[PDB]
Amino acid sequence: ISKEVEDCVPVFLKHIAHDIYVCGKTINLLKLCCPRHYLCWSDVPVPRISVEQAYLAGLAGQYHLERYPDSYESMSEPPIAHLLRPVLPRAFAFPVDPQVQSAADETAVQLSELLTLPVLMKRSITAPLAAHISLVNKAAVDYFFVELHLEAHYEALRHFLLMEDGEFAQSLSDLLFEKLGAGQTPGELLNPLVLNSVLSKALQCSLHGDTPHASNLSLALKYLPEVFAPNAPDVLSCLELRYKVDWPLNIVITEGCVSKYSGVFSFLLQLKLMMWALKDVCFHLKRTALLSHMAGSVQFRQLQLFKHEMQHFVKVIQGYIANQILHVTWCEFRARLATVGDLEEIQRAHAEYLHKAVFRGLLTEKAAPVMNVIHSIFSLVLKFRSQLISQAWGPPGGPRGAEHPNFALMQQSYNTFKYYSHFLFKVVTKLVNRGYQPHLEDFLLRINFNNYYQ
Amino acid sequence: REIITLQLGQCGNQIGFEFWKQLCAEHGISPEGIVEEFATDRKDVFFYQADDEHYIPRAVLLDLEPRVIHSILNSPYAKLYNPENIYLGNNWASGFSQGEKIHEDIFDIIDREADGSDSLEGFVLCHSIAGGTGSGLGSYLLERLNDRYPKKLVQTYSVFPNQDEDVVVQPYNSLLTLKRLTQNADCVVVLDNTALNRIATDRLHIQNPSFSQINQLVSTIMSASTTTLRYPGYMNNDLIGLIASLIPTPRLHFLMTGYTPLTTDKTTVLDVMRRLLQPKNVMVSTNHCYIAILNIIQGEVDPTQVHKSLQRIRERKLANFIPWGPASIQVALSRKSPYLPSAHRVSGLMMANHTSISSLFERTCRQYDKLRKREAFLEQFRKEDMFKDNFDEMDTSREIVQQLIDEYHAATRPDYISWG
Amino acid sequence: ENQNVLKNQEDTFAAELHRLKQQPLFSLVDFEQVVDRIRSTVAEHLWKLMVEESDLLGQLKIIKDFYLLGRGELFQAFIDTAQHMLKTPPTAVTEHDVNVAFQQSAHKVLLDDDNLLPLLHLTIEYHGSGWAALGLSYKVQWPLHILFTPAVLEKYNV
Lengths: 454, 420, 158
Ligand SMILES: Nc1nc2c(ncn2[C@@H]2O[C@H](COP(=O)(O)OP(=O)(O)O)[C@@H](O)[C@H]2O)c(=O)[nH]1
Hints:
- By secondary structure, chain A is an all-alpha fold.
- Helices cover 64% and strands 1% of the residues of chain A.
- Chain A is elongated and about 115 Å long.
- It is classed as cell cycle.
- Keywords: microtubule organizing center, microtubule, gamma-tubulin ring complex, gamma-tubulin small complex, spindle organization, microtubule nucleation, cell cycle.
C-alpha cells in the first residue's frame, strides 16, 4: 500500500492505496477472461475521464409449486445484461454533475485564501474513482455467481465431500466397508479399479441425481497403507476425495481450502464406520434371531442390552456433529454468501464456512482431549463387538452363558466403555469452566440430558 | 430397500386406502398412477416405478368374503394401485383358519413383489386388533412372514381398539393377537379409537361418525411417521436406524403417538417441542416413566432455536422419565412438501416408548380375565372348539402378555439390568 | 468521521470563516456567533442519529432494569436460587457458576425474548462472602460509547 514504507498520503491517503490495487486486478481478470456485454473492454459508454377433485386440487398445488419459480425469478433477476447497460451512461453522467460544479468551485476554492479548506481537502477531486470501483465489484459478483452458478459448486461439494446427501454417503462407505472388514486387507481394496468402480457405483446409485456437477468427483488415496489393522479401523485411512476446480473459481476455491473440506469426510466416515458394525451386530443377534426361539437364553437378554447402551452413545455423537455443522453453519454461510459483494469478501465467507465447521467438529487442535476420549471409546466399541461375532452359541440347557463363551470378557469391556463415558461426562465440563467454548455447552447438554449419568 | 405394506381386513384396508391416497396428493402422483405435470423426494422406497412414470404403491390388499370391499375398487384411485394382487367371520379363530387354506396364493403375491423390487427391507401391516376377519388372519400372516423372511424387519400400525367397550369376544380376539404380535413383530405403533374419538370431540363436534373422520387422524400420523424416509435427509434415511432408538429392548416394541398441531388446519421450535409433552396432544388413552423419546418437526424451522429449544425443554422437564435406557429425547427435522398448503407450515409429531401403554394392555386382559371366569362367550362355535379344543393358547397368550405387563413395570424399576 | 469504511456546509462555513479572516480587527462576538452556529448544527444532527437510529430510551430502561434492580422478580429469584454459591467464599471458578445461575434465573422468570441476555454477565474477583465481589457489566454499542465511558458505569457499579 506504501512504496516500501514510503506511502503517499497526498495521493493514496492509504485509502485508495488498496482500492486502486483491487479494481486494477478485477477489470484485468474479467476482461482477461472475455469481453462481457456490461464492460466488453472499452465498450463502456462515455465514462468521464475525471481523475377430478385430485386434478383441481393438483392445479391449486401447481400454482403453489409455480409460486416457487415466481419467487426464483428474483434469484435469476440480477444477470439482466440489457438493463445493466442503461445504468452506466446514467451512472457516469451522475458523477459529471459533481465534476461540473467541482471545477468551477475549484476556481472559487482556489480564489478563496489560495484554499478556503485545508490542503488535505484536495482528496475531494479524486473521490469519483469510487464510482468505477462500485461498478467493478458488482459486475464481478454476477459473473462469479449467476453466470458461473458458484453456489451450486459449494452446494455439491457440501453434498458429496461433507456427505450432506444421505443416500450417497451410506453407499460409498457401505461397499468399501464390506471389503475392508472382509479381507483384501493388504491394500487389495486400493486397486485403482475397485476404487473407481465403487465411486461411480456410489455416484450413480445416490438418486439425489446425475448432473454436470457430479463431474470433477474423484476417489483417491494419499498415504499408502502397509496393511489394514485389527478391527479394520482405517482410523486415518488416507482415501482423499479430490475435486477439480475451473480456472476462474480456481481463484475462488484455494487448494488449502479444499484441503480442509477433506477432513470432515474422514471423521464422518469413521463415524459411519462405527455405525456400520453396530447395525450389523444387532443384525447378527437378529442373524441368530434366537432362531432357536425354542430356546430363550437369559444371557442373550443381558447382552441384547449391552449392545444398545454402546449404540446409544454413538448415535448421540453422530447427532451432535450433524446439527452443529449440517444445519447450524451452512445456513450462516448461505446468508454470508448472499451478503459478500467483492472477491476478497467472497474468500472470507467460504474461509469461515469451514474454519467454523472445523471448530464445531472438535477436530480443532485445542480441543484434542475430547477427540482423544472418543478414540478410546470408538476403539473399544469396534474391537469388543467384533469378539461376539468371532464365537458361536453352545448347547441348549439351563443357564447358557457359554453361548459365545467369550461373553464374560465382554462384560469387563462393557465396564471400560462406561468408565470412559463417565470420564467424558467429567471431561467436557473440565474444559467449559476454564475458558469460553460456547459450542461445548451443546455437547454436554445432550450427553446428560436427564442425569449425573444414564 | 423398498417397503411392502400388507394392508389386511376391512378396517386395515380402509386406513391403507387413505394412507396411499394421502401420499398421492402429498407426492407428485395422480389417480391414474401417472405423475402430475406440475411436479427432490425419495419416492423409490414407497412407490414402484413403472416405465411410463406410473408410480404404483407396493400395496398388498387382502380381502375375505368381500362385499363392502368392492367400494375400494369403485374409486378414481383404482388405477393408481394396480399390482393386480387382491385375493378372495368375526372370530379370531374364524379368521386364522380361513387364512391357512389360502396361505400359499397370498404368500406367492408376497413373493411376486419381493422378486419385482430391487430389494425388500420391511413388511408394514395396516393391522386391526380384534378386527373380526382382520385379527386371526393378521396373526397367522405375522407368523409366516418372520420364518420365510427372517432378514427383513416388520412393523404393525396396530389400531388397538378401545370404544369404551359390538364384539362380546373382543377381549379374547385381542388377547390372542398380542401373544403373536409380541412374539412375531420387530416393531408395533399403537393407536386408540377412544383416544382419537376424544380428540375428535375436542377439535371438532363430530361424535356419531367417529370412524370416517378418525380415519384422517390415523392417516396424518401414518404419513408423518415415515416422512423422514419419504423425503431426503442427512440421517435416519434407512428405516432401521429410525427403529433402533424408539425400541431399546425387544419385548417393549410398542410406540405411543402425538401431533403438536392437534389442529394444523409463525411457531418457534421451542413451542412446537413443548406441545408434544402436553397430554392433550397425545393420542393414547406406582411411578411411571417414558423409556426413550424421539420427535420430527416439519417445514423451514429456524435451527438456532433448537439448541435453545433442546436445552429449553430440559429446564421445562415437561417429560418425566428415568428408565434403565438412557432416554435423551432425540431431535429430528424434515421438509414440509411443496404441493400441499403452507398453513401451519411448522407442524410436528412424536413417537415414544412409554410404560403407560401397559395399562391399556392390562384393561383388555382385565376384561378377558373377568370374561374367562364367566366363560360367557367361549363361542363353542364348532370352528372355535375344533380349532381350539384345549382352549390353552388363550392361557399361553395370558402368561406371555402378563410377562409383558410385568416386564413394563420392571422397566419403571431401577433394576432392568437384571432379567425382566 | 472514522468507523465509516455529515451535511456539506463545510464550504458555507468555510465561506463564513473566510469572511471572518478578511475582517481587520478581532470581534469575539462574530467568532462566537459562527462557531456556535456550527456547534449547534453538529449537536442537532448528532442527537437525531443516536436518539432515533439507535433508540437510547430502551438502552436506559435496560441499564436501570439491571444495574438499578429495576427487575424485581428476576433479581429476587437470582438471590433465591444461588443463595449458597454466593454465600461461600470467592475463588477462580465461582464466576461461571453464578452466571449459569443468573441465566438459569432469567428463564426461571420465563419472561424472555431473543437476545436481551447477550449484553450482560456477572464478574466475580478473587485474591483481589462472595456477595462482596459481585460486579455487573454491560456491552455498549459504538455510538453510545462516549455517553457511557467506563467511569459512569463504574459509578453505576457501586
Ligand atoms: N380407526 C378405524 N377403525 C375402524 C374403522 N372401522 C372399523 N374400525 C375398527 O375395526 C374393528 C372391527 O373390525 P371389523 O370392521 O369388524 O372388521 P370386519 O370383520 O372385516 O368387519 C373395531 O375394533 C373398530 O374399532 C375406521 O374407519 N377407522
